[PDB]
């Protein structure tokens, strides 16, 4: 049993590290989502910077 | 010993199922940064692009 809590408090040691960077990944996600839309919006806002300019 | 040993198994299992979770935001958080460094590639080669055009 103490074993066993042992690795329940070990398991969820893990899992609360797996957790913070779950969230850690998942908020890097987020932000990554909204870097990668603000990216491809920037990819086209340079896209247009461009076609101005080659305008 | 029952519930030690399922709470080994409840943690392990959910950290398990982070791990699974956290590999899914870490490939999406992957694809994210490899979609937004894209991005920023594209962001760059606009950017050289405008420097080009701009000059």
Not at 19 to 48: G, H, P
């Amino acid at each position: 049993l103490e074993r066993a809590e042992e690795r329940a408090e070990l398991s969820e040691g893990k899992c609360a590290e797996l957790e913070e960077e779950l969230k850690t990944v998942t908020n890097n996600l987020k932000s990554l989502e909204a870097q990668a839309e603000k990216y491809s919006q920037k990819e086209d806002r340079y896209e247009e910077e461009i076609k101005v300019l080659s305008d």
